[PDB]
Design a protein around this ligand. Structure first.
Ligand SMILES: *[C@@H]1O[C@H](CO)[C@@H](O[C@@H]2O[C@H](CO)[C@@H](O)[C@H](O)[C@H]2NC(C)=O)[C@H](O)[C@H]1NC(C)=O
Ligand SMILES: *[C@@H]1O[C@H](CO)[C@@H](O[C@@H]2O[C@H](CO)[C@@H](O)[C@H](O)[C@H]2NC(C)=O)[C@H](O)[C@H]1NC(C)=O
Ligand SMILES: *[C@@H]1O[C@H](CO)[C@@H](O[C@@H]2O[C@H](CO)[C@@H](O)[C@H](O)[C@H]2NC(C)=O)[C@H](O)[C@H]1NC(C)=O
Ligand SMILES: *[C@@H]1O[C@H](CO)[C@@H](O[C@@H]2O[C@H](CO)[C@@H](O)[C@H](O)[C@H]2NC(C)=O)[C@H](O)[C@H]1NC(C)=O
Ligand SMILES: *[C@@H]1O[C@H](CO)[C@@H](O[C@@H]2O[C@H](CO)[C@@H](O)[C@H](O)[C@H]2NC(C)=O)[C@H](O)[C@H]1NC(C)=O
Ligand SMILES: *[C@@H]1O[C@H](CO)[C@@H](O[C@@H]2O[C@H](CO)[C@@H](O)[C@H](O)[C@H]2NC(C)=O)[C@H](O)[C@H]1NC(C)=O
Ligand SMILES: *[C@@H]1O[C@H](CO)[C@@H](O[C@@H]2O[C@H](CO)[C@@H](O)[C@H](O)[C@H]2NC(C)=O)[C@H](O)[C@H]1NC(C)=O
Ligand SMILES: *[C@@H]1O[C@H](CO)[C@@H](O)[C@H](O)[C@H]1NC(C)=O
Ligand SMILES: *[C@@H]1O[C@H](CO)[C@@H](O)[C@H](O)[C@H]1NC(C)=O
Ligand SMILES: *[C@@H]1O[C@H](CO)[C@@H](O)[C@H](O)[C@H]1NC(C)=O
Ligand SMILES: *[C@@H]1O[C@H](CO)[C@@H](O)[C@H](O)[C@H]1NC(C)=O
Ligand SMILES: *[C@@H]1O[C@H](CO)[C@@H](O)[C@H](O)[C@H]1NC(C)=O
Ligand SMILES: *[C@@H]1O[C@H](CO)[C@@H](O)[C@H](O)[C@H]1NC(C)=O
Ligand SMILES: *[C@@H]1O[C@H](CO)[C@@H](O)[C@H](O)[C@H]1NC(C)=O
Ligand SMILES: *[C@@H]1O[C@H](CO)[C@@H](O)[C@H](O)[C@H]1NC(C)=O
Ligand SMILES: *[C@@H]1O[C@H](CO)[C@@H](O)[C@H](O)[C@H]1NC(C)=O
Ligand SMILES: *[C@@H]1O[C@H](CO)[C@@H](O)[C@H](O)[C@H]1NC(C)=O
Ligand SMILES: [Ca+2]
Ligand SMILES: [Ca+2]
Lengths: 754, 754
């Protein structure tokens, strides 16, 4: 009766006991990711015994299952791998079973949620938790016990294709969503995988995997907080390191971050895996070792002792040299023992040794995956993420009567899903046209015209769209950006966002802007919906359209969510998770810019009639955000009262509770406001962010009513990184700005730390 | 008689002896910059004795004289101030007398050289050293003994207004020019002032004075080298600190850079001044102290102990609190003593105590300022700076016969000088039209038409320009960017470059691009001259025009220099000091990007007929340079032979001499080539720049001849900053790429450090 098999033994002793029975071959197997296609034929589902035997022995710790195959292919072949481990190895160390979950379990016919950049606009972490719980239920049904999220990278470089996968530009909002997502996932004993550690998403020129310029203060002030929350407070069982270098140290091989910060400072107890092919990049991209033939020893010696425990597939499996390095005396066995211990500790705490089998039987999968509860939530979370940017003269909400033109490439014909969806997803779900026709039924005439193809400058379709508008009371035009599913993205089909699709312009592509102009020029009131994965730069829309709506990449319920807002069944409540610049020329545009940035001189202007008004910052443009972080309108108006703090003279150990009464001055409808609290460290020892979101509350306010909003500020969380790179909450004044966006401040107060 | 007065006493002993005789008031006075307008009325020249007494007592160490006044106002009032020091103070500590010299002594009717971004394209540091010697002659004539250059900031942020004041994007080229400029100046016992220390010219969003994101590795690898050469090798007697923060530490208050690096590592022996109002910024922009009323103590305590010795004017003279701080026990007298000592030591080394008077008599100024030698050099250096970008079917050089159209806002009507020119400069000098007319005399008909105004979208002028082209055999169109003199710049007149004039676009402004198209459509062969202070993004010009010429902001001889190239009296020899992007959306674009950057996937393309071809990096654009660093054509072709190294197995103490024979295959013309040597550290312990200019040689090769070019590489200069932030030349292979640009490599070799 080996002690490691006994659940009454403390976890640390179970780890010790198991580790001391393991051969070096078995230890290495734990640290190298396998793949379900080592024993499962992706096209036929046929089983290859020899490949399972090899995979288990050589890369047996964990394996990837993110293939677009039938449900039973995943479940039956995961089962065979777990049964093989249990019945046909000495030690029976259960496998971690890994797929993607970003905005839904990555398998066909599972529930697709709106993209992360969008659900961040909900400012509704509780609802995002509920999502993560239902995602874990779907994944769990087929035998998955690990998912490759959350992404707690920040949208700080708008040209980068993966903006959509983030929770926005702000550390606090991302950290809070990260925490909730992780909690909802791990509530099922499914491992989260907090990614991409660390400082990944500000690549040079916006290019996928390109290196990042920045210093240690920026890393600790802005990049690291969102990881800290998911890791330290939500107890994430795994982390993925990143593809980039940060001031010239590769993320995958950074001892300072992966060991000194992650373990010595934060006490992280579990494992870090590389990204996919990230280990080879040490030689191939970064040129820190010989690329041909690849110096597998050198790669291993760079990343494993740095604290990157596990090598992901997609590369050359450089970690197969661990045995040789140990025999040569070049790698201390204790480094291997620490990495293995981290993996085993996660497996014990996940419960895998007591319950290695996750999956439900085939007869139950339809009762666990794509449930009405999941579909309903997708629509709820989607509708709560929609951001009203403009609404002139009560154009919205639309009346469910008369005639309505529905125009534009994104209105119909394909679902405008973000990246990290499975092949052929785009052929199912609710389009804006579907949604709008469902909401009006027989009460309004709908006149649909495609208008243009998103990927073409061709204006053949304009006449039909102009005609549709001209015979309608109002026009809805749906344009934006597009991405691709996991097959089409990597086959090279055209895209304007997604992993490895980066842009040098944020303006509407192809004929989409000219299509809007042709409709507006009919004089019919035109509502423009932006359907997209990042900011779009078209400032002329704000005041030349009747209304302007942002729906970041939808859920499978997107068109219903959208029509719920358009016709006013739901009073829009989204706030921007990411700042909108006037031009790609104006980047970066994050709201949390250090003092001395952004607001410097006078802006120039180009008028549409040709007149140039010359300024300084810039000569002929404006570095101020077109729309700021936290911006979002309502059909209802909100009047804030005086801001109150419960305590004014405080200590670094205190909590200051911010209070404010918010009145819904609309007498006819309920409205939801997101009250946002920004902290300003007024006078600091080093230069700090001008203002930082440090709390918020989304509240539903009945018509004509006043609601008391209370938001706590833990003083310990408002510090900075001083000249000695120590975290301190320096004595002195802290401003508290309370408002409806990062710019729209409605009241303020000041407290003093002593 | 006191030891400090005796030239035979060692300098450190002279400093000790003098410092020991100074009151704390006299010490304070050395560390605070005065201003000649404290005793000279700017408009009348009247002397104010009271104001000289006060300036001398309170801010008497050094004073500024950069006012647009007659020569005798400067000379007579400088004399008054030096005479007052000598005869009417106890100690007779001569004043340092400061002005600007960026591309010419900053006084009316002195020689104006081309702007620095242009003269860097000459790759001729010896000629630039000649320029700095003549500049010092001109300055010295009026009693100036300190000039506020060189700028050794790098043009790494192309939106930033002061790109034109830099020597380009490359550390090595900027370092070499900085060295030579410093040496030229100080050959006259005139102090250089190396600026802006350090990391200033990559401001966030390209906005003037905005903070800079970067780590210490980037700072040491890229930003600091150019400072090192001027300071440590050329012996610069003064430094100016910068306006920015770097990873959140203000440059003005950074102990690590100003003291640890500059003194403890580099052994710098002299003084550092703040920039203008840069002291107040500590409270006002950076928010590190109370702004109102400004906390003068806190400013002083932040910058003086950090190693910023001298407070410049343009602020609140926070240093007047030095005395109170010493009295309160808050500032150690030894800090002040160190700072004063730094100033005195410079003054002793400059020879000021033996020769405090610089100036020549009134009757000689016309023989010392704006001499034929200076005017000729301005034309020679300007012509050597012109970069031929394209030349199809031998459109260039032009014949001095037939008819020639000269078109565009920059062809005539004003001189397109860069910034750091004195009020009303723009009304003197040779315009392109002036130069072209002088060059052809009666041998060709010149058909001039303005075409458009640079600051306007109005196309009224096009028909006249079109007519001018149509009645000519060839058309020359001069467009680009424009700046302003020191008065008009700060009065707010319109500009597209210069200090506090930043841009969010690099496309030709106003009617300029459409002007070009209108002329081209004429079918007359069209040569475009870009007349500008930074890259312009118009890729369509390369193959839609007959030829394409870059003249960065001209000298007062610009039009002659331009005509010298256009008509082929000079075979153009310039090479780009800064890389040209396709679009402002593609930034940054420096040639020395870290491995893993820039070269990542496939580029898309927008055809002029509207067809879209979608790529990845970027979807619809190209992150590769339109023209790279070091790019420049000639009328002549050059054929490189095999590259040879004199040594292959070397150590860090050795020098490797690169040799290659370059043949001028042109049978009719002499031609000048700039041979460029880029070093590649093949395998490194940390990520490094992909390639780095480490040597070059500009050679004149007679028609048909072959010339041996030898370029030395000191191995000690080819190292990196490792993970412990130590500079190391790591054993292993170094690639040597020899070519006509950073991209056009014609030969290579490898040596091995042991
Ligand atoms: C079943 O699995 C094993 C995987 O081990 C496969 O064996 C490999 O065969 C390929 C090509 O034929 C060789 O490149 C590899 O070296 C082999 N790998 C090993 C470790 O043996 C086998 O081909 C698979 N068979 C089927 C039908 O899929
Ligand atoms: C997840 O894992 C833990 C560890 O297996 C489970 O906790 C055990 O729960 C079992 C119930 O079968 C109990 O008998 C043990 O007392 C618990 N052990 C510990 C350490 O708490 C937990 O139930 C699992 N949770 C879920 C949702 O599956
Ligand atoms: C962008 O991708 C789409 C596919 O989504 C391409 O459209 C297909 O193109 C071929 C014609 O070459 C047709 O046979 C298909 O019927 C088209 N499919 C659809 C859904 O329309 C499109 O051509 C691509 N565009 C560009 C410019 O690359
Ligand atoms: C001559 O010099 C003194 C400068 O010391 C001038 O006096 C100043 O007067 C101004 C305004 O008139 C006051 O604001 C300052 O406080 C004075 N400074 C000091 C310390 O006295 C005097 O105005 C000058 N006279 C001229 C040029 O006419
Ligand atoms: C620059 O200053 C130095 C120091 O004052 C000058 O050198 C001195 O000149 C005298 C004779 O005039 C020599 O006998 C001394 O030995 C020199 N001293 C040193 C330290 O070298 C120098 O000539 C001046 N140079 C110029 C161009 O004016
Ligand atoms: C840009 O600056 C020029 C000056 O260089 C302005 O033109 C001047 O405009 C003033 C004021 O109306 C006139 O009195 C001058 O006669 C103009 N000078 C010239 C050369 O015409 C010009 O209007 C400015 N343009 C803009 C759009 O700001
Ligand atoms: C202008 O035309 C030249 C010649 O066609 C282009 O240079 C070529 O660029 C292609 C890229 O497609 C290279 O693969 C060729 O090897 C180059 N050929 C030569 C002879 O240089 C150039 O790119 C065009 N410039 C622009 C701005 O479009
Ligand atoms: C899967 O099966 C098909 C045919 O049955 C075969 O062509 C394909 O190559 C197989 N792949 C692997 C890796 O076994
Ligand atoms: C999804 O259901 C659709 C129904 O047409 C079907 O084509 C496909 O086989 C299903 N996918 C999975 C993974 O069950
Ligand atoms: C695994 O072990 C069981 C015995 O417990 C055995 O019956 C079965 O044959 C084994 N399977 C394989 C694939 O070796
Ligand atoms: C639209 O108009 C409002 C009201 O005048 C104004 O404040 C806002 O700046 C305008 N937006 C744009 C993008 O010009
Ligand atoms: C164009 O608009 C500007 C902006 O108000 C105005 O001053 C100017 O006079 C207008 N010009 C024309 C040509 O209408
Ligand atoms: C907080 O502190 C100041 C003393 O520094 C005191 O004057 C003030 O009344 C206190 N305010 C509150 C709200 O207790
Ligand atoms: C210079 O003198 C004129 C009188 O000619 C006067 O108007 C002006 O104020 C004076 N400037 C100063 C600084 O005293
Ligand atoms: C420069 O020369 C012109 C004469 O052409 C004169 O107007 C001006 O006053 C002179 N400036 C100086 C500083 O000598
Ligand atoms: C300076 O000292 C000289 C020499 O004694 C004296 O003649 C002169 O009057 C003084 N000048 C001033 C302005 O005080
Ligand atoms: C537009 O130019 C592209 C370049 O190949 C071509 O494929 C397309 O057909 C052109 N359109 C025209 C002239 O049909
Ligand atoms: Ca503070
Ligand atoms: Ca090396």
């Amino acid at each position: 009766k080996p002690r490691y098999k006994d659940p009454s033994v403390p976890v640390e002793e179970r780890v010790t006991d198991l580790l001391g029975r393991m051969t070096l071959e078995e230890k290495m197997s734990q640290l190298i990711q396998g793949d379900i296609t080592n024993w499962m034929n992706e096209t036929t589902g046929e089983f290859n015994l020899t490949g399972l035997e090899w995979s288990t022995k050589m890369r047996g710790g964990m394996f990837y299952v993110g293939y677009p195959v039938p449900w039973d292919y995943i479940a039956d072949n995961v089962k065979k791998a777990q049964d093989y481990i249990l019945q046909n190895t000495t030690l029976g160390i259960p496998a971690i079973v890994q797929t993607e979950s970003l905005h839904g379990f990555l398998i066909g016919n599972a529930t697709i949620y709106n993209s992360p950049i969008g659900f961040a606009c909900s400012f509704n972490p509780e609802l995002i938790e509920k999502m993560a719980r239902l995602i874990g239920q779907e994944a769990s049904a087929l035998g998955v016990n690990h998912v490759m999220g959350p992404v707690v990278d920040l949208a700080r470089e708008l040209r980068f294709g993966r903006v959509e996968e983030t929770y926005g530009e702000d550390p606090f909002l991302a950290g809070e969503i990260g925490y909730h997502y992780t909690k909802g996932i791990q509530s099922h004993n499914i491992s989260a995988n907090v990614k991409h550690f660390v400082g990944f998403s500000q690549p040079e020129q916006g290019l996928n995997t390109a290196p990042v310029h920045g210093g240690e203060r920026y890393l600790r002030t802005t990049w690291l907080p969102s990881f800290k929350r998911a890791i330290m407070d939500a107890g994430a069982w795994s982390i993925m390191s990143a593809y980039h270098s940060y001031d010239g140290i590769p993320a995958v091989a950074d001892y300072h971050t992966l060991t000194e910060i992650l373990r010595e400072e934060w006490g992280y107890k579990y494992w870090v895996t590389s990204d996919a092919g990230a280990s080879d990049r040490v030689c191939t991209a970064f040129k820190l070792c010989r690329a041909d033939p690849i110096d597998k020893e050198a790669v291993t010696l760079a990343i494993l002792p740095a604290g990157n425990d596990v090598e992901m597939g997609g590369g050359s499996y450089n970690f197969e040299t661990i045995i040789d390095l140990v025999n040569a005396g070049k790698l201390d066995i204790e480094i291997v023992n620490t990495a293995v211990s981290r993996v085993l500790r996660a497996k014990f705490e996940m419960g895998l040794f007591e319950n290695p089998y996750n999956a439900a039987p085939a007869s139950e999968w339809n009762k666990l995956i794509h449930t009405q509860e999941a579909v309903d939530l997708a629509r709820e979370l989607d509708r709560e993420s929609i951001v009203l940017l403009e609404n002139h003269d009560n154009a919205l909400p639309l009346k469910k009567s008369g005639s309505i033109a529905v125009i534009g490439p994104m209105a119909h014909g394909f679902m405008n899903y973000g990246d990290y969806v499975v092949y052929e997803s785009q052929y199912r779900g609710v389009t804006p046209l579907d949604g709008i026709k469902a909401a009006v039924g027989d009460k309004a005439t709908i006149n649909y015209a495609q208008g243009c193809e998103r990927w073409s400058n061709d204006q053949s379709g304009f006449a039909e769209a102009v005609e549709a508008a001209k015979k309608s009371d109002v026009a809805v035009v749906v344009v934006g950006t597009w991405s691709r599913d996991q097959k089409e993205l990597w086959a090279g089909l055209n895209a304007t966002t997604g992993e490895h699709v980066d842009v040098n312009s944020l303006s509407l592509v192809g004929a989409q802007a000219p299509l809007i102009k042709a409709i507006i020029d009919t004089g019919v009131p035109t509502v423009v919906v932006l359907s997209s994965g990042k900011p779009i730069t078209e400032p002329w829309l704000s005041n030349n359209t009747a209304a302007l709506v942002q729906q970041f990449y939808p859920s499978e319920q997107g068109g219903n969510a959208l029509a719920d807002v358009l016709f006013g069944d739901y009073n829009p409540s989204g706030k921007l998770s990411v700042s909108f610049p006037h031009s790609v020329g104006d980047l970066p545009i994050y709201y949390d810019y250090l003092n001395s940035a952004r607001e410097i001189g006078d802006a120039g202007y180009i008028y549409s009639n040709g007149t140039l008004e010359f300024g300084h910052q810039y000569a002929l443009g404006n570095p101020k955000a077109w729309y700021p972080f936290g911006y979002g309108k309502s059909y209802s108006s909100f009047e804030y009262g005086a801001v109150k703090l419960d305590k004014t003279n405080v200590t670094e150990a205190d909590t200051v509770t911010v209070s404010v009464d918010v009145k819904n001055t609309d007498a006819t409808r309920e409205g939801t406001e997101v009250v946002q609290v920004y902290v300003v460290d007024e006078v600091a020892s080093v230069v700090v962010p001008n203002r930082l979101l440090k709390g918020f509350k989304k509240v539903v306010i009945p018509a004509g009513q006043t609601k008391t909003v209370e938001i706590p500020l833990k003083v310990q969380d408002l510090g900075l990184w001083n000249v000695r790179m120590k975290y301190v909450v320096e004595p002195g004044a802290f401003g508290v700005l309370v408002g409806s966006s990062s710019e729209d401040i409605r009241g303020n107060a000041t407290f003093y730390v002593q």
